[PDB]
Design an enzyme around this catalytic site. Structure first.
Site, PDB file in Angstrom:
ATOM      1  N   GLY A 103     -28.540  12.185  20.776  1.00 41.49           N
ATOM      2  CA  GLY A 103     -29.530  11.429  21.435  1.00 41.49           C
ATOM      3  C   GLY A 103     -28.853  10.145  21.618  1.00 41.49           C
ATOM      4  O   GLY A 103     -29.482   9.102  21.655  1.00 41.49           O
ATOM      5  N   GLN A 104     -27.515  10.161  21.725  1.00 40.83           N
ATOM      6  CA  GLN A 104     -26.714   9.000  21.899  1.00 40.83           C
ATOM      7  C   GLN A 104     -26.850   8.705  23.311  1.00 40.83           C
ATOM      8  O   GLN A 104     -27.578   9.350  24.033  1.00 40.83           O
ATOM      9  N   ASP A 105     -26.315   7.574  23.676  1.00 40.44           N
ATOM     10  CA  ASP A 105     -26.816   6.873  24.795  1.00 40.44           C
ATOM     11  C   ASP A 105     -26.981   7.553  26.120  1.00 40.44           C
ATOM     12  O   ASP A 105     -28.105   7.832  26.483  1.00 40.44           O
TER      13      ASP A 105
ATOM     14  N   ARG B 191     -28.735  11.183  25.596  1.00 34.54           N
ATOM     15  CA  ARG B 191     -30.125  10.986  25.691  1.00 34.54           C
ATOM     16  C   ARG B 191     -30.550  10.693  27.103  1.00 34.54           C
ATOM     17  O   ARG B 191     -31.517  11.257  27.597  1.00 34.54           O
TER      18      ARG B 191
END
Lengths: 159, 290, 177
Positions: free
Chosen positions: A53-55, A58
């Site tokens: 859910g990293q930048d 996500r």
């Protein structure tokens, strides 16, 4: 079914996964991307995207915006950090409609790993308390623990 | 309102890979024109991180390679990082051919966000006991050196030490080719070393030095003896390639009446031996120059 | 490199298949080449022509030409071997000769260029063996059985969990003088 593991994966969110898959553990660099497995049950073979859910990742999942069928939320139960913030995000899933085609499981992972919240405490906190147009029984794991999981799931495909 | 893009999609299901193969060919042909309109990307995306079909992957991959990739999507289609992690694994793959093949591809490949930890990854792969894999790195690196040399910066020496570790002629040959392009100096140092040994050895690598030496003198000399010592040994000369070069290099180097003679002989015999006429003419042409 | 392209040719004014080692331009380099090749320049015979310092290297093999191109010097024989060698390889690679078969085994054929020749270097011998290297392997399998199995065990078990829960010198002196 498309089953979704999101949050930032590399934390052992991915561990959580690797543990399922081989029995093993994160022996990868902490993993932003799609991790895929098919797990077969009711021989719906659940295709798991363990996705950070990293930048970007996500940020960008639109091709994966399609229609869901299963929910794992893999949890740092030491995180009790991004969850309100998460709740704030989470609404937009809620505001998605594809997203209402899954009877799910939030999985509390990383219990041994520091601690965890009231099963309830969390429940409001991600905003979880509030659903119903999808089922919503709750299941804790850890990432060095978790059982009865499958009860949760049992109901779930058989929703 | 509907389209045959979809027609292909069902086929793929229908067969699996097989149908898809067909699809690749079509796609290819479609691709070949330029031409396509997107959407299958999604399909591809969907099935492929969870799918094998190695050959297909190879087709796929190549397709990616030949086709653009800094695609109007980006740059990347934008997943150029995520999918790669499987691929990275493959690249990691214990599975050596598989890595090697990738590497081959990889030499062709040049996609940076993906490269960076693959730099680490590659480094590991070099260690693998397969000369095929290792060799493949030599191309790949070559590919870096122009594209993002820097990406790796410590290399020329690293190679050079590597050479020390090394002993597969095939790889060596390669090693030279690249090494001088990075820097001659290392090769030279080694050259000093090798001087006696050469004679023992296989040609191909030997050749490569002959080019290098040439450029530098016109710019500047003073270097001779060490060379000479060898060079005389080179005045054995005996492969048709060796000989072909050997007189050719000599003239490049020299033109003393004695020199004139030496080369000349080589030709004359050569010719005499010679059979392919096309060849014969060529030397003349040189001669014509001469 | 010692060849920026290998293109296998048929008589047609057109080269039956090709591959571009390096892209930049457009076919017009390749396209132009194709045109010239088709034209042959009416020229009678001769399996080689180099013009304007460009080797156009070919071999008629039948109604087919296999073609290589280069511009600066080379050692011939080696080369020949290759043209010829191509002429050994194909009925194996793509099956016999007629464009189509090749049309089906394009991938195979291109793969063969790369495989055979790594940038103008004669890589090996033994065609079958050549098959071997990829899409024909060994390691991967070895690994897979064990591994897959291991996982599988974990899985199986899981199913239950789930389920329920002197000479030199002569010269040298002379020269030296």
């Amino acid at each position: 079914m498309r089953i979704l593991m999101v949050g930032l994966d590399g934390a052992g969110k991915t561990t959580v996964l690797y543990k399922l898959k081989l029995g093993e553990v994160i022996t990868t660099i902490p993993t932003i991307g799609f991790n895929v497995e098919t797990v077969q049950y009711k021989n719906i073979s659940f295709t798991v995207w363990d996705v950070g859910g990293q930048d970007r990742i996500r940020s960008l999942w639109r091709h994966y915006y399609r229609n869901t069928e299963g929910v794992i939320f893999v949890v740092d139960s030491n995180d009790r950090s991004r969850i309100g913030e998460a709740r704030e995000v989470m609404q937009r899933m809620l505001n998605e409609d594809e997203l209402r085609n899954a009877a799910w499981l939030v999985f509390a992972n990383k219990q041994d790993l520091p601690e965890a919240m009231s099963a309830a405490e969390i429940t409001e906190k991600l905003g979880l308390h509030s659903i119903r147009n999808r089922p919503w029984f709750i299941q804790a794991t850890c990432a060095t623990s978790g059982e009865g999981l499958y009860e949760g799931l049992e109901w779930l495909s058989n929703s | 309102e509907p389209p045959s893009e979809i027609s292909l999609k069902n086929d793929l299901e229908k067969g699996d890979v097989k149908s898809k193969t067909e699809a690749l060919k079509k796609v290819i042909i479609m691709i070949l024109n330029g031409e396509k309109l997107p959407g299958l990307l999604m399909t591809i995306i969907r099935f492929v991180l969870p799918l094998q079909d190695h050959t297909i992957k190879k087709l796929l991959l190549v397709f990616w390679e030949i086709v653009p990739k800094t695609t109007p999507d980006g740059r990347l289609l934008h997943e150029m990082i995520l999918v790669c992690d499987a691929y990275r694994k493959d690249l990691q793959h214990p599975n050596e051919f598989i890595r090697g093949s990738t590497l081959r591809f990889l030499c062709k490949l040049k996609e940076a966000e993906l490269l960076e930890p693959l730099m680490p990854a590659i480094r590991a792969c070099l260690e693998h006991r397969h000369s095929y894999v290792r060799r493949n790195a030599v191309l790949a690196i070559y590919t870096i050196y122009r594209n993002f040399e820097h990406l790796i910066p410590d290399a020329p020496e690293l190679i050079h030490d590597f050479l020390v570790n090394e002993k597969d002629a095939s790889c060596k040959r390669n090693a030279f080719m690249m090494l001088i392009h990075a820097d001659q100096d290392r090769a030279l140092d080694y050259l000093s070393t090798c001087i006696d040994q050469v004679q023992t050895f296989g040609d191909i690598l030997q050749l490569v030095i002959v080019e290098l030496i040439y450029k530098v003198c016109h710019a500047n000399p003073s270097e001779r003896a060490r060379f000479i010592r060898c060079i005389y040994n080179l005045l054995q000369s005996s492969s048709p390639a060796v000989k072909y070069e050997a007189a050719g290099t000599l003239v490049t180097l020299s033109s003393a009446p004695t020199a004139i003679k030496a080369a000349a002989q080589c030709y004359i015999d050569l010719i005499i031996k010679e059979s392919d006429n096309n060849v014969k003419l060529i030397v003349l042409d040189r001669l014509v120059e001469l | 490199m010692v060849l920026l392209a290998a293109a296998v040719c048929t008589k047609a004014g057109k080269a039956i298949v090709s591959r571009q080692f390096v892209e930049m331009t457009r076919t017009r380099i390749e396209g132009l080449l194709a045109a010239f090749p088709k034209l042959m320049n009416t020229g009678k015979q001769h399996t080689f022509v180099e013009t304007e310092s460009v080797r156009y290297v070919y071999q008629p093999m039948e109604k087919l030409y296999m073609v290589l191109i280069t511009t600066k010097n080379s050692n011939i024989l080696e080369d020949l071997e290759t043209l010829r060698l191509f002429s050994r390889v194909i009925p194996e690679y793509c099956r016999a000769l007629e464009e189509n078969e090749i049309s089906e085994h394009c991938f195979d054929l291109i793969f063969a260029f790369d495989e055979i020749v790594a940038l103008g270097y004669r890589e090996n011998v033994n065609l079958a063996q050549i098959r071997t290297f990829t899409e024909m392997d060994s390691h991967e399998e070895k690994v897979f059985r064990a591994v897959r199995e291991t996982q599988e065990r974990e899985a199986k078990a899981e199913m239950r969990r789930k389920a329920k829960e002197k000479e030199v010198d002569n010269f040298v002196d002379k020269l030296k003088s």
